[PDB]
Design an enzyme around this catalytic site. Structure first.
Site, PDB file in Angstrom:
ATOM      1  N   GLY A 182       0.838  -1.190   0.000  1.00 23.27           N
ATOM      2  CA  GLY A 182       0.000   0.000   0.000  1.00 23.27           C
ATOM      3  C   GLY A 182       0.871   1.237   0.000  1.00 23.27           C
ATOM      4  N   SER A 219       1.205   3.578  -2.634  1.00 27.17           N
ATOM      5  CA  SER A 219       0.926   4.542  -3.705  1.00 27.17           C
ATOM      6  C   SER A 219       0.633   5.939  -3.179  1.00 27.17           C
ATOM      7  CB  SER A 219      -0.224   4.053  -4.613  1.00 27.17           C
ATOM      8  OG  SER A 219      -1.390   3.818  -3.841  1.00 27.17           O
ATOM      9  N   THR A 272      -2.833  -2.296  -5.511  1.00 27.02           N
ATOM     10  CA  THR A 272      -3.736  -3.325  -6.006  1.00 27.02           C
ATOM     11  C   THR A 272      -3.989  -3.230  -7.496  1.00 27.02           C
ATOM     12  OG1 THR A 272      -5.554  -1.895  -5.272  1.00 27.02           O
ATOM     13  CG2 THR A 272      -4.907  -3.703  -3.817  1.00 27.02           C
ATOM     14  N   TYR A 279     -11.543   1.870  16.111  1.00 23.52           N
ATOM     15  CA  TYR A 279     -10.132   2.189  16.319  1.00 23.52           C
ATOM     16  C   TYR A 279      -9.553   1.396  17.482  1.00 23.52           C
ATOM     17  CZ  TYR A 279      -5.819   4.688  17.378  1.00 23.52           C
ATOM     18  OH  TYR A 279      -4.507   5.036  17.558  1.00 23.52           O
ATOM     19  N   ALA A 320      -9.363  -2.333  16.274  1.00 22.75           N
ATOM     20  CA  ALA A 320      -8.297  -2.528  15.308  1.00 22.75           C
ATOM     21  C   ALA A 320      -6.972  -2.518  16.055  1.00 22.75           C
ATOM     22  CB  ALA A 320      -8.325  -1.449  14.233  1.00 22.75           C
TER      23      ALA A 320
END
Ligand SMILES: Nc1nc(-c2ccccc2)cn1NC(=O)Nc1ccccc1F
Ligand SMILES: Nc1nc(-c2ccccc2)cn1NC(=O)Nc1ccccc1F
Lengths: 236, 245, 240, 231
Positions: free
Chosen positions: C21, C23, C46, C147, C150
């Site tokens: 990831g 980009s 992706t 949050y 996670a």
């Protein structure tokens, strides 16, 4: 085969109002002989009325947990008159000084009641945290700090006294309906309701039931634990 | 029209993994408090055994076969209960499904998928009644090595974050969601590893003893009560002062 | 699949790093930081246009590496991708996972992707008897429930994996960003931004670079005794 | 871009082990380093080590338990070398309670004293090194360090001052070198990395936290324990 505290003497600091009062009545409901305390004579008197008024055997005393003399003398008075307190609930309460002072008071009182519990090879010490309600940024810093201090303290003390069948636990109230918090400015109260999944303030009784449970023989394997009672609102 | 401090009269409770040890102790405790108790096991003989134990201790309820890993099992089981006994408003997940420090992931992933499955299925009932208790029992200490610590610490962290998150999601409907994290409990596992190594375990526990299954059950019993209504997203350790994460 | 100054910072010289990831935002900042430290950097996205963009950015900042297409949710993608990297650039010994009822599925899906990728790169690190795995958390973003969850998932996971692979001199760590300046957060109404800043003791949003420096450090030999740790990078804003 | 050129750093308890390693690391990064010890021979030793490794700085006698010592010491530094903007508290000191209460009173004493300087400069790093029977005391010291570090970070944050802690696990030091092989191996068996950590490995973390790159890290406690967590 029950949660009966018949025959046990309990000491609840800061019992003239709110949470402490609700704790004194709950331990009374469970059959404990209850000594509640306050810092003034009229507070102590009031504790006594409330006890008789709810059919609880016990007393109101004047106690300042910040002073060694008050503590020593008070405990003596209790020993000479009502017996040894085997249940003890510390509920009588800039971040640094607040926390440092509170924890010095916990340790003071805890150490003083410990001789009695050691002798009886049984005991409950329960530490009530500060309620959430804190005019400002200062107040989040102060609540988070007080909580972290309570938790590490409670855990450490539990490890020290555990071998004598004495549990040591804490209860960390969230936003509780009390005389203090009913006075907060509406924007502040509503912003706090907005943070609570249950969508309401907790009742003093709802803290007291937890303390009631922790004091029971059923909670004998629970020690060094801090039970949050906050409706799902967690602040650290 | 009754009302007392710890009663669960009139409430239906569902206790998964109730055929022995902790789960059995939990089923009897909720029974003792007046709940109608459905206990479950993965096998017919387990379910039979649950039923004997209930009648043998005067508890109104049932033993059912339930595989919490399967959507069909869960849906069908809950239907049977609704058809016959009413809606389960107390739900205690205790059915967790040589071990090494690499098995942690799968154990925890599987457990938590089962919690979520079952929890979501019973939630419709609790939502409708605007009241509910979900209580999740953690894994006991299953091996005393490195292998055993990795797995216990992991199972605990997963249980805690899950319990907290779910409590936040369902809280607005007066449904508490809590966990109990047992330490070293006197069970089938702990009894059969001979003592010189097992006795070393008591030295790690400040209370100096193993906890009893009943002592887990009393905590569950309390959390299920109206008195515990403001406790949610909490994980209560019941470990005699032995903390490992 | 698109591919003499000796800077003093170049301490990860000779190591191949894989940043998922990459980009934009944090991942991009991480790729450039590990590049700055001398790593050969493979960043992933992706899509083909994402991978193209990663490659431009690398060349544009003088970093030796590549942009690849990778879907961390798929075993085939992961296996094939890693094989391409082995055959072309060598074995990735630094690996930074930054590529992400909603509350449960998000966390379950992420952690399944961490484990997939982590297990796949682990053979290479095992053989080299050295390795860094670094897991970037959920930034901030109903948002409170997710949050805390996670975070608890990331942390128990990171800790458990660290214990499993530790004996092979492979550290496994996480970074838990707070409120980071990204292109979305710059556009809030002043009242909303100020209210958020009022919750952060440092009084500002963190920069992507500031996450990247922590990753940069954790990747170094100096951080060799740090493992199973989750480093919060939140300006003093701690949410539970 | 890890440089600390132009910054003055104060490292308490720098005569040996972790503190020494921290002083040399901040020196390596270009800081002017004042290390401290409680004795004159300790302070002398700190000075030898600095010159011996080409680090500009000094060794001072400092007792962090005493207001007078702290005030005077900081004055000496201000008058001679400038204001210390990086400050690493590594001088540690019914036994659990007093240990932790005394340590945290020392952190707060020193921290408050150096804060005036950092406030003035609108930049600062405060880093608190944790302690390296035994579980109660370690778990307690850790919980105290963490809540303290977090609370102080919140208080001083608005002035671009980070406050962080480092919680070492089992480090190779003069204490650990004394344990019987069965006891040390049983300890290695608890550490996934399978080894004791080096003092330098604590020092690199401190070195990083002191940098501008770590500016958004505050109120954090970084464990540096090889994967061994005890709470
Ligand atoms: N004096 C003091 N300040 C603080 C503190 C301040 C802010 C946040 C957390 C703890 C804690 N204490 N605590 C102590 O005196 N003792 C103490 C603290 C944590 C765990 C065990 C302890 F004994
Ligand atoms: N697959 C997985 N592994 C873990 C985990 C592993 C080690 C320690 C803590 C959690 C958790 N999970 N799965 C989840 O679906 N959700 C989840 C995990 C942790 C916290 C909250 C969660 F929703």
């Amino acid at each position: 085969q029950s949660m009966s505290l018949q025959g046990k003497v309990a000491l609840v600091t800061g019992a003239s109002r709110g949470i402490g009062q609700a704790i004194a009545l709950e331990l009374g409901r469970l059959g404990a002989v209850v000594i509640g305390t306050a810092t003034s004579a009229s507070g102590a008197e009031k504790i006594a009325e409330t006890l008789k008024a709810n059919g609880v055997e016990g007393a109101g005393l004047v106690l300042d947990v910040s002073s060694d003399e008050s503590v020593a003398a008070t405990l003596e008075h209790i020993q000479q008159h009502l017996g040894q307190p085997l249940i003890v609930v510390n509920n009588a309460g800039e971040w640094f000084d607040v926390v440092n002072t509170n924890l010095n008071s916990l340790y003071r009182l805890s150490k003083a009641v410990l001789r009695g519990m050691t002798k009886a090879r049984w005991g409950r010490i329960i530490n009530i945290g500060s309620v959430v309600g804190a005019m400002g940024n200062a107040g989040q810093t102060n609540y988070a700090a007080a909580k972290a201090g309570l938790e590490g303290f409670t855990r450490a003390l539990a490890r020290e006294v555990g071998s004598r069948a004495i549990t040591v636990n804490a209860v960390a109230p969230g936003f509780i309906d009390t005389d203090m918090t009913r006075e907060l400015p509406e924007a502040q109260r509503e912003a706090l309701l907005g943070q609570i999944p249950l969508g309401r303030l907790g009742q003093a009784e709802e803290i007291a039931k937890v303390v009631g449970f922790l004091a029971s023989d059923g909670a004998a394997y629970v020690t060094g634990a801090t039970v949050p009672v906050n409706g799902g609102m967690y602040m650290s």
